[PDB]
Amino acid sequence: ARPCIPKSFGYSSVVCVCNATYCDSFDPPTFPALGTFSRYESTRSGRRMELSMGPIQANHTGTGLLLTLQPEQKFQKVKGFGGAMTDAAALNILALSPPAQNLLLKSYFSEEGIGYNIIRVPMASCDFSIRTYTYADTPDDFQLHNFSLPEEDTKLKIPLIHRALQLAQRPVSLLASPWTSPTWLKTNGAVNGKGSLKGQPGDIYHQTWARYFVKFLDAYAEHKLQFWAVTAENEPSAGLLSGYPFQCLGFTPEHQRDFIARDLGPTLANSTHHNVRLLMLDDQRLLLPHWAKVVLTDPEAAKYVHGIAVHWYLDFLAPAKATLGETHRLFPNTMLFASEACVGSKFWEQSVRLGSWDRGMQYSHSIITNLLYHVVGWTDWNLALNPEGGPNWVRNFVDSPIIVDITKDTFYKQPMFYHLGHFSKFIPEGSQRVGLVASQKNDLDAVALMHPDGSAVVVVLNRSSKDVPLTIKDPAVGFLETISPGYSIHTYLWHRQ
Ligand SMILES: *[C@@H]1O[C@H](CO)[C@@H](O)[C@H](O)[C@H]1NC(C)=O
């Protein structure tokens, strides 16, 4: 339906300008006969998920690279795509006038937007909060009689999540993660720095902590919200580093194991919330395969772990094949999920760069690498930030796909939002990654998937400056002659019968 309104802030590409009366959006999804494909194209030059169609022909006029769909080569099924409703994202969204809020929510959650079906939710304060708090701040309340939700949940987070879910087509899955416990459960009695739970797994501190998860799930369920899954702790390794500035809670891989086996696993299993899944790690892939070896070789722990959550931030330090591929080799039945799909992004640049094509490219390149290394799901960090990359009570280092200007009742959809959308919009939950063979060495990032109804989706990323002639073969349909322009991303979609 409505086109992108471009604006330049002096970076390599444009943002799309939205406000209370206008946002760029899509017509309800509509797909052509066998023999025809749809192509969605974004370019550095300014095109934004622009749709064209053409033929899938019986004869091959391409003399360059060929990608061949191999539907009989079948891999992981996809859980999905989303981001995080941090207090910072909620405050930024709620600083818009209500009709602008809806245009923002539709942008992410509607079929007329990009089809998000996962929301990550922090269990209390993190660095993207304006203040420190947990749900049980009164000391020595080991039965947690004074557990409650603040304004942050009941006023900002929960309403925005209800509104996301009304907007969404697909069922949305909720994922929760803790940053810190009550500080009276901690060896350092502080929200941050080097500090663990007091005592040992099995004790009163660890039982109380495990019970807090259940209290949180009960509280959200009073608000008629249920969780797909919880992670065992956000960035547990951060809590082992002295002076760590953000909310945290240290677990060694061994402590995580024992806490799971002794406390979190049995407590959740013993609650009415026993269908909620558990993801271990929620941290840098550099920590793999080790962390998974420690936790998952102990069957009293492993029986409670459904998946392994990873963060992207420090990916450049550790190859996908050594970490993700190696972990899959060893525990092929434990899913890999990107719970904090965020990098960012060069000590000599600002937090937020409006219209950065490069940061876009980094998102899609990273989703593609993940997909080729068995990852089933991706949750971006903050849904929305202000232009200084906040609020953050400690310090901003990261960009966001939507940047909200609260002085102008306007929001900016960054190139990152469209790189994401090239995946989230066209890869519904249950989609299976399938084979896609390059005929010769090339510079493109490419992946193929089959929808639950058997139709084909292919994304092609060109991170070079130069146009690449391309043919895509489907053995069941024919050849698709196309071109990958320099600095573009294409999503191709087609019926297979
Ligand atoms: C919102 O954006 C639309 C599209 O540019 C524009 O025509 C309208 O003037 C905007 N509203 C305000 C208050 O700027």
Swiss-Prot record:
Keywords: Cholesterol metabolism, Disease variant, Disulfide bond, Gaucher disease, Glycoprotein, Glycosidase, Glycosyltransferase, Hydrolase, Ichthyosis, Lipid metabolism, Lysosome, Membrane, Neurodegeneration, Parkinson disease, Parkinsonism, Pharmaceutical, Signal, Sphingolipid metabolism, Steroid metabolism, Sterol metabolism, Transferase
Recorded superkingdom: Eukaryota
Annotated effect of mutating residue 463 to P: In GD; loss of glucosylceramidase activity; increases susceptibility to proteolytic degradation
Impact after mutating residue 48 to W: In GD1; decreased glucosylceramidase activity
Annotated phenotype, changing residue 4 to S: Loss of glucosylceramidase activity
Effect of residue 463 to C: In GD1 and GD2; also found in patients with Parkinson disease; no effect on protein abundance; decreased glucosylceramidase activity
Residues annotated as the enzyme's active site: 235, 340
pH dependence: Optimum pH is 5.3.
This protein's name: Lysosomal acid glucosylceramidase
Function: Glucosylceramidase that catalyzes, within the lysosomal compartment, the hydrolysis of glucosylceramides/GlcCers (such as beta-D-glucosyl-(1<->1')-N-acylsphing-4-enine) into free ceramides (such as N-acylsphing-4-enine) and glucose. Plays a central role in the degradation of complex lipids and the turnover of cellular membranes. Through the production of ceramides, participates in the PKC-activated salvage pathway of ceramide formation. Catalyzes the glucosylation of cholesterol, through a transglucosylation reaction where glucose is transferred from GlcCer to cholesterol.
Activity-regulation annotation: Synergistically activated by saposin-A and saposin-C, two saposin peptides produced by proteolytic processing of prosaposin/PSAP. Saposin-C activates GBA1 through its recruitment to membranes. The membrane structure and composition in anionic phospholipids are also important for the activation. Activated by PKC in the salvage pathway of ceramide formation. Inhibited by conduritol B epoxide/CBE.
Oligomer status and interactors: Interacts with saposin-C. Interacts with SCARB2. Interacts with TCP1. May interacts with SNCA; this interaction may inhibit the glucosylceramidase activity. Interacts with GRN; this interaction prevents aggregation of GBA1-SCARB2 complex via interaction with HSPA1A upon stress.
Variant or mutagenesis effect after changing residue 271 to N: In GD1; severely decreased glucosylceramidase activity; less than 5% of normal activity
Result of changing residue 235 to K: In GD2; loss of glucosylceramide catabolic process
Similarity-based family: Belongs to the glycosyl hydrolase 30 family.
Consequence of changing residue 140 to H: In GD1; decreased glucosylceramide catabolic process
Effect of residue 444 to R: In GD1 and GD2
Annotated phenotype, changing residue 191 to E: In GD1; very low glucosylceramidase activity
Impact after mutating residue 257 to Q: In GD1 and GD2; also found in a patient with Parkinson disease
Pfam families: Glyco_hydro_30, Glyco_hydro_30C
Outcome after substituting residue 131 to L: In GD1 and GD2
Glycan attachment points: 19, 59, 146, 270, 462
Pathway: Steroid metabolism; cholesterol metabolism; Sphingolipid metabolism
Outcome of substituting residue 198 to E: In GD2; severe; loss of glucosylceramidase activity; increases susceptibility to proteolytic degradation
